Design an enzyme around this catalytic site. Structure first.
Site, PDB file in Angstrom:
ATOM      1  N   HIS B  47      12.044  26.222  35.237  1.00 32.83           N
ATOM      2  CA  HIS B  47      11.196  24.999  34.989  1.00 32.83           C
ATOM      3  C   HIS B  47      12.007  23.892  34.690  1.00 32.83           C
ATOM      4  O   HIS B  47      12.908  23.915  34.266  1.00 32.83           O
ATOM      5  CB  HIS B  47      10.111  25.148  34.066  1.00 32.83           C
ATOM      6  N   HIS B  49      11.963  20.579  32.598  1.00 36.53           N
ATOM      7  CA  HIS B  49      11.349  20.054  31.672  1.00 36.53           C
ATOM      8  C   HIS B  49      11.642  18.733  31.609  1.00 36.53           C
ATOM      9  O   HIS B  49      12.512  18.196  32.127  1.00 36.53           O
ATOM     10  CB  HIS B  49      11.732  20.705  30.309  1.00 36.53           C
ATOM     11  N   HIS B  64       7.032  20.879  30.274  1.00 38.50           N
ATOM     12  CA  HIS B  64       7.439  20.719  31.734  1.00 38.50           C
ATOM     13  C   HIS B  64       7.070  19.358  32.140  1.00 38.50           C
ATOM     14  O   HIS B  64       6.356  18.552  31.785  1.00 38.50           O
ATOM     15  CB  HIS B  64       6.523  21.808  32.618  1.00 38.50           C
ATOM     16  N   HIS B  72      -0.533  23.699  34.559  1.00 39.46           N
ATOM     17  CA  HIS B  72       0.623  24.393  35.109  1.00 39.46           C
ATOM     18  C   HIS B  72       0.379  25.399  36.400  1.00 39.46           C
ATOM     19  O   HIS B  72      -1.164  25.883  36.357  1.00 39.46           O
ATOM     20  CB  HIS B  72       1.349  25.420  34.022  1.00 39.46           C
ATOM     21  N   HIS B  81       2.515  21.238  37.522  1.00 46.03           N
ATOM     22  CA  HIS B  81       3.312  20.316  37.339  1.00 46.03           C
ATOM     23  C   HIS B  81       4.502  19.956  38.183  1.00 46.03           C
ATOM     24  O   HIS B  81       4.949  21.043  39.010  1.00 46.03           O
ATOM     25  CB  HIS B  81       4.046  20.685  35.740  1.00 46.03           C
ATOM     26  N   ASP B  84       7.496  22.764  38.025  1.00 47.62           N
ATOM     27  CA  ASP B  84       6.893  23.977  38.112  1.00 47.62           C
ATOM     28  C   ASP B  84       7.668  24.547  39.306  1.00 47.62           C
ATOM     29  O   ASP B  84       7.219  24.625  40.400  1.00 47.62           O
ATOM     30  CB  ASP B  84       5.420  23.839  38.382  1.00 47.62           C
ATOM     31  N   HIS B 121      13.575  30.795  31.534  1.00 52.35           N
ATOM     32  CA  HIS B 121      12.724  31.567  30.458  1.00 52.35           C
ATOM     33  C   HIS B 121      12.901  33.068  30.203  1.00 52.35           C
ATOM     34  O   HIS B 121      13.294  33.408  31.075  1.00 52.35           O
ATOM     35  CB  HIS B 121      11.208  31.097  30.581  1.00 52.35           C
ATOM     36  N   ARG B 144      13.039  29.785  25.807  1.00 55.15           N
ATOM     37  CA  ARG B 144      14.013  29.160  26.535  1.00 55.15           C
ATOM     38  C   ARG B 144      15.519  30.155  26.598  1.00 55.15           C
ATOM     39  O   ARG B 144      16.073  29.805  25.348  1.00 55.15           O
ATOM     40  CB  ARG B 144      14.172  27.732  26.275  1.00 55.15           C
TER      41      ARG B 144
HETATM   42 ZN    ZN Z   1       4.330  24.181  34.100  1.00 59.55          ZN
END
Ligand code: ZN
Ligand code: A1LYN
Ligand code: A1LYN
Ligand code: A1LYN
Ligand code: ZN
Lengths: 154, 154
Positions: B47, B49, B64, B72, B81, B84, B121, B144
Site C-alpha cells: 500500500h 500510505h 492509506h 479500502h 484508496h 490500494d 504489510h 508494517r
Molecule cells: Zn486502503
C-alpha cells in the site's frame, strides 16, 4: 499545494536527524528546521540533491538539485542551485540545531523538493567561492554523511 | 513531469527491497516492479500510505493514501484508496518479485505518490471484502514490515 514536509537523515555512521519543512504560503519561503546529531563540531554542507534515490546509499541521490542549470552558490546568491541551502553548524556536543529560511526551494511547483534527497555533508560548503571546479559543483563539502528522501508530512 | 520513481523499503526486521515506478505518460498507467526479500511465503498487503514521514518508523506514514476519502478496496475496485495496490506474493525463498500496473496512482497530479510512503504489510490484504471495520480501512493486512519514502528517480 503541500505545506509541510519532513526528512529522516540516516547514513553509514553516527549522523542522524529529523528535518522539518514548512511553507504556509505556496509563493512564500520555506522554513527548514530540526536537529542533526553525531556530527563533528563546525560547518557542514546542507543540500537538496536531485533524486530521492537511496538504492546505493546517499550516492545515488545524484548532484545538487539544479533545475535552472546554474553554478553552486550560497543560499543568498542569485547564482545558486535550487538545492543550495548553505551550511549548518554542529556545536561541541555534535548537534546541529538547524534553522533556515529559504525563498528558492519550494514544497510545490517546479522547485518542489518533495521526493528529492536532503544530504548533510562531511565538510564546510565554501558557497562556490573556493576557486576550484569542485567549488562550483558541490562547494567542496565532501562526502555524504547522512541523507533521506523528503516526504509529505501531516 | 516526473516519469520515474524509486523506493527503498527497510524496517525493524529482515524485510527489505527496492521498488521502481515508471509512468511514461501522465494520463497513463504506472508500472511498479522490483524485488522484496525477507518475507514469509505468501500474500502481503502492499500500500501507499499518506505521509512520507518515517520519524517513528513505518507507523508515522499514517493511513492509506486516500485523498477521495473512499473505503479500502483492491486495485481493481472502483471503491478503493488511491494507495490500494493489493497484495504482493513472496515465494518459498521469501522473495516478492513485484510486477504491478496501476492507473489510479500517479507520479504527478492529485494522485501523485512521490513523497509518500510505500509499505509492505505482515498479512494478506483482504481487498476490503473482510466484512469487519478493519477491512474497510487496511484490508486486515496487519503490521508494517518495511517501508520507504517514494522518491524521484533518474
Ligand atoms: Zn486502503
Ligand atoms: O528534529 C528533532 C529531533 C531530531 C533528532 C532525532 C535523531 C534522529 C532520530 C531518527 O533518525 C528518526 O527515526
Ligand atoms: O490478492 C489475491 C488474494 C485476495 C484475497 C485475500 C484473502 C485474505 C483473507 C484473510 O484470512 C484475511 O484475514
Ligand atoms: O476477502 C474475501 C475474498 C476471498 C475469499 C476466498 C476464500 C477462499 C475459500 C476457499 O473455500 C478456501 O478453501
Ligand atoms: Zn549546489
Amino acid at each position: 499545494m503541500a505545506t509541510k514536509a519532513v526528512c529522516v537523515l540516516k547514513g553509514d555512521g553516527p549522523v542522524q536527524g529529523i528535518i522539518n519543512f514548512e511553507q504556509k504560503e505556496s509563493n512564500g519561503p520555506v522554513k527548514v528546521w530540526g536537529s542533526i546529531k553525531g556530527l563533528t563540531e563546525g560547518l557542514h554542507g546542507f543540500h537538496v540533491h536531485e533524486f530521492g534515490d537511496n538504492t546505493a546509499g546517499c550516492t545515488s541521490a545524484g548532484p545538487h538539485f539544479n533545475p535552472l542549470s546554474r553554478k553552486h552558490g550560497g543560499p543568498k546568491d542569485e547564482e545558486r542551485h535550487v538545492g543550495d541551502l548553505g551550511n549548518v553548524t554542529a556545536d561541541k556536543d555534535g548537534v546541529a540545531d538547524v534553522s533556515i529560511e529559504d525563498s528558492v526551494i519550494s514544497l510545490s511547483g517546479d522547485h518542489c523538493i518533495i521526493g528529492r534527497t536532503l544530504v548533510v555533508h562531511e565538510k564546510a560548503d565554501d558557497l562556490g567561492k573556493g576557486g576550484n571546479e569542485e567549488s562550483t559543483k558541490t562547494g567542496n563539502a565532501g562526502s555524504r554523511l547522512a541523507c533521506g528522501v523528503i516526504g509529505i508530512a501531516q
